[PDB]
RNA sequence: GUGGGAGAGGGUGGUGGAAUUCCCGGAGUAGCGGUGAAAUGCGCAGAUACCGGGAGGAACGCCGAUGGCGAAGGCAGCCACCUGGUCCACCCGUGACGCUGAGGCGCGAAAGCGUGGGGAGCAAACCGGAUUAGAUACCCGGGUAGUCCACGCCCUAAACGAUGCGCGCUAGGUCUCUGGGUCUCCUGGGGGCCGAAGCUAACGCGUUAAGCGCGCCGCCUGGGGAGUACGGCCGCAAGGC
């Protein structure tokens, strides 16, 4: 198992009934693919640099997990299925390379 | 018959012609002119004089609809691309701002033999 | 790929003695494992030709060490080939 | 002119999510500054280019912008 | 072996924005386009220019470099999986296990061929417009095969560093990529520029040798005829050795 970082941006117009559903759906998808969650950072409403899906903002999520490597691309396929889910980018974790130290 | 009094003005300047369109803040055009709308016919349209007269013809057409404030957009390089702007500032229309939005691709399509 | 967990498993199995890391038997074992990792990677991905080159270099090196073992001590050569299922 | 690394602190060059600092490395347009203007090293600029492209796909850094002059 | 390291190295899938074309709507009149000038072309069935939305294919701007990777061909969005090569620190292990390499086998830009897809842009042939003494061309408008993908052939090149490979030896200075180090620097492995000795017909090369040596393979012996004829092998063909 390697360690990855998940970036999810969904439609920033959801109420709490839809936001809890979309997010607990992301929880259920991680359980089926064996993603041990290490920490979570939720930014939320953030000003986008260009329109995405005709919408000028986006609700941001970030998960750091440890999972088997072979199932990553099938996990990316499972997240983009949801309509509200718009951006899915999974990056292998890396060390914080410093500059001007 | 519109009474807009404010809007955008696009300048599409090529090496073969310079053409000006005047619109409203949403993008929909009001009037327009070019090097061919005025008497010039051939290569004379890609000249700075034609670029000046075309800019001023559209400006007087926008006065009919009551235009005072004007935001300027410019696309393309060519003779008279600057002479049209300089004509537009002294056209009575108080020029609000000037933006260059010339579309540059990310090397997506293969150009004609001319451009290679 | 090939983690150091699986690596130590092979070295300790084919070592002539504790601490031995570079015996000819140990080199051929390690070479053979990467052969089977690539030959299975080349069953699929049949159009990967740059990886195909590295496999020829490993086969040439594996046969280079076996041809050496054949000359010096032919017994350990047979005990090695029978243990890896080659030739 | 000053350079970006000269007027800055100790920052993470691999953090694609820190837009406040990565906006410093973009020009007036969405373009990426050359090394002459960022004051970075060879290896640093290569990492910055990749982490900027990541932020671009996350809607955080603009692909291209509009120049207000001329 | 151990521990680290950089990378358009490769293969597979996924994915992002810009732009071109086309469709839909909104708005909007008289031309746009193109050239040294023009004309064919397109436009009142409403184009060009502008806003919004959609479809599709192909190529990845800036970063980008005189840079990096690869045995060569060659490899540029991003993400992930699979994966090759290579380099450095430790001085740990085996104990000459090495070098080259006629055949063989595998790879091999583009173009072309077969089968089936795909088809936005570009574009042989070809259809036109000009130029011209003429235009079987450069310039202009259209446009098919093809360029893209899958599978199978084809084996050529300015396939270039016009420099086969490996090793040892022979002043340095300077720019650089990437490691390690007691980090004005030293020490490696590549990528450039000047230049000692020396070589070379000269231009020029010069620790990345074209220098001094050694091992092995390939090849050369006047031009035209001619990379043609015959024969053979290979190929569906074009044709290749
Ligand atoms: Mg979706
Ligand atoms: Mg003209
Ligand atoms: Mg790669
Ligand atoms: Mg690749
Ligand atoms: Mg329409
Ligand atoms: Mg007509
Ligand atoms: Mg008509
Ligand atoms: Mg008609
Ligand atoms: Mg179509
Ligand atoms: Mg460039
Ligand atoms: Mg080349
Ligand atoms: Mg690797
Ligand atoms: Mg020793
Ligand atoms: Mg020893
Ligand atoms: Mg001993
Ligand atoms: Mg060899
Ligand atoms: Mg051979
Ligand atoms: Mg070929
Ligand atoms: Mg081809
Ligand atoms: Mg074909
Ligand atoms: Mg064309
Ligand atoms: Mg043509
Ligand atoms: Mg003549
Ligand atoms: Mg004629
Ligand atoms: Mg010669
Ligand atoms: Mg020689
Ligand atoms: Mg250092
Ligand atoms: Mg190299
Ligand atoms: Mg060097
Ligand atoms: Mg001399
Ligand atoms: Mg000579
Ligand atoms: Mg020199
Ligand atoms: Mg030498
Ligand atoms: Mg010959
Ligand atoms: Mg003769
Ligand atoms: Mg020939
Ligand atoms: Mg004969
Ligand atoms: Mg023959
Ligand atoms: Mg035959
Ligand atoms: Mg021929």
Alpha-carbon gap, residue A70 to A86, rounded angstroms:
23
CA A21 to chain centre: 15
- Count Cβ neighbours within 10 Å for each residue of B58-84 and write b for 16 or more, e otherwise: bbebbeebebeebbbbbebebbbbbbb
Q: Using a CB–CB cutoff of 8 Å, tell me whether D58 touches chain A.
A: yes
Contacts of A59 in chain D (CB under 8 A): none
How do the domains of chain D map onto residue ranges? 1-70
- B92 HSE (CA, 13 A, CB side): 13
Contacts of C20 (CB under 8 A, 6+ apart): C26
Q: Is residue B72 part of a domain?
A: yes
At D1 the three-state DSSP class reads coil
Alpha-carbon gap, residue D12 to D47, rounded angstroms:
11
By the 8 A CB rule, do B19 and B80 touch?
Answer: no
Smallest CA–CA distance from A89 into chain D, residue: D58
Alpha-carbon gap, residue D37 to D48, rounded angstroms:
13
* Cα separations in angstroms, A33 against A29, A77, A79, A90: 7, 12, 11, 14
Alpha-carbon gap, residue D55 to D17, rounded angstroms:
6
The residue among B8, C48, D16, C24 whose CA lies nearest residue A93 is D16
**Quick one: tokens of A11?**
């439609």
Q: What is the resolution of this structure in A?
A: 3.8
**Quick one: tokens of B33?**
């002119």
The secondary element (H helix, E strand) that includes residue B41 is none
Contacts of C41 (CB under 8 A, 6+ apart): C48, C51
What is the B107 CA–ligand 9 centroid distance (Å)? 21
Cα dihedral A31, A32, A35, A41 sign: negative
Residues constituting chain D = 70
**Quick one: tokens of B88?**
């537009």
Alpha-carbon gap, residue C76 to C74, rounded angstroms:
6
Output Rg (C-alpha) for chain D, integer angstroms. 12
Looking up tokens 């499972």 gives A78
Domain span including residue B35: 6-115
By the 8 A CB rule, do A37 and A63 touch?
Answer: yes
- Inter-chain CB proximity D66 and B85 less than 8 Å: no
Instruction: Enter the CATH code of domain A1-97.
Output: 3.30.70.60
The residues with which B75 forms a beta bridge, in sequence order, are B12
Q: Using a CB–CB cutoff of 8 Å, tell me whether D2 touches chain B.
A: no
The residue among C53, C78, C77 whose CA lies nearest residue C65 is C77
**Quick one: tokens of D44?**
């640093």
CATH number of B62's domain: 3.30.420.80
By the 8 A CB rule, do A14 and A92 touch?
Answer: no
Contacts of B101 in chain D (CB under 8 A): 66
Alpha-carbon gap, residue C69 to C23, rounded angstroms:
11
DSSP 8-state class, residue C44: S
Alpha-carbon gap, residue B35 to B83, rounded angstroms:
13
- Inter-chain CB proximity D67 and B74 less than 8 Å: no
């Amino acid at each position: 198992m390697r360690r990855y970082e998940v970036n999810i941006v969904l439609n920033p117009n959801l109420d709490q009934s839809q936001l809890a559903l979309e997010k607990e759906i992301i929880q259920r998808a991680l359980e089926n693919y064996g993603a041990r969650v290490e920490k979570v950072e939720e930014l939320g409403l953030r000003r986008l640099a260009y329109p995405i899906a005709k919408d000028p903002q986006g609700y941001f999520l970030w998960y750091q997990v440890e999972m088997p490597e072979d199932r990553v691309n099938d996990l990316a396929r499972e997240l983009r299925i949801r309509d509200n889910v718009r951006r899915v980018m999974v990056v292998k974790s890396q060390e914080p390379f410093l500059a001007n130290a | 018959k519109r009474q807009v009094a404010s809007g955008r003005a696009y300048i599409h300047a090529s090496y073969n012609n310079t053409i000006v369109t005047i619109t409203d803040p949403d993008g929909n055009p009001i009037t327009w002119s070019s090097g061919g709308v005025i008497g010039y016919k051939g290569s004379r349209k890609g000249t700075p004089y034609a670029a000046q007269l075309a800019a001023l013809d559209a400006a007087k057409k926008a006065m009919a609809y009551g235009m005072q404030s004007v935001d300027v957009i410019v696309r393309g390089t060519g003779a008279g691309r600057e002479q049209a702007i300089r004509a537009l500032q002294a056209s009575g229309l108080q020029v609000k701002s000037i933006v260059d939005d010339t579309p540059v691709p990310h090397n997506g399509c293969r150009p004609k033999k001319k451009f290679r | 790929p090939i983690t150091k967990e699986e690596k130590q498993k092979v070295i300790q199995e084919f070592a002539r003695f504790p601490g031995d890391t570079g015996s000819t038997e140990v080199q051929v074992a390690l070479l053979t494992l990467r052969i089977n990792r690539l030959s299975e990677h080349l069953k699929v991905h049949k159009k990967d030709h740059h990886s195909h080159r590295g496999l020829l270099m490993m086969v040439g090196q594996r046969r280079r060490l076996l041809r050496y073992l054949q000359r010096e001590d032919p017994e350990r050569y047979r005990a090695l080939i029978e243990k890896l299922g080659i030739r | 002119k000053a350079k970006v690394k000269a007027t800055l602190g100790e920052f993470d060059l691999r953090d694609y999510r820190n837009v406040e600092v990565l906006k410093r490395f973009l020009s007036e347009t969405g373009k990426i500054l050359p090394r002459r203007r960022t004051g970075l090293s060879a290896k640093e600029q290569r990492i910055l280019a990749k982490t900027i492209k990541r932020a671009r796909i996350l809607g955080l850094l603009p692909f291209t912008e509009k120049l207000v002059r001329k």
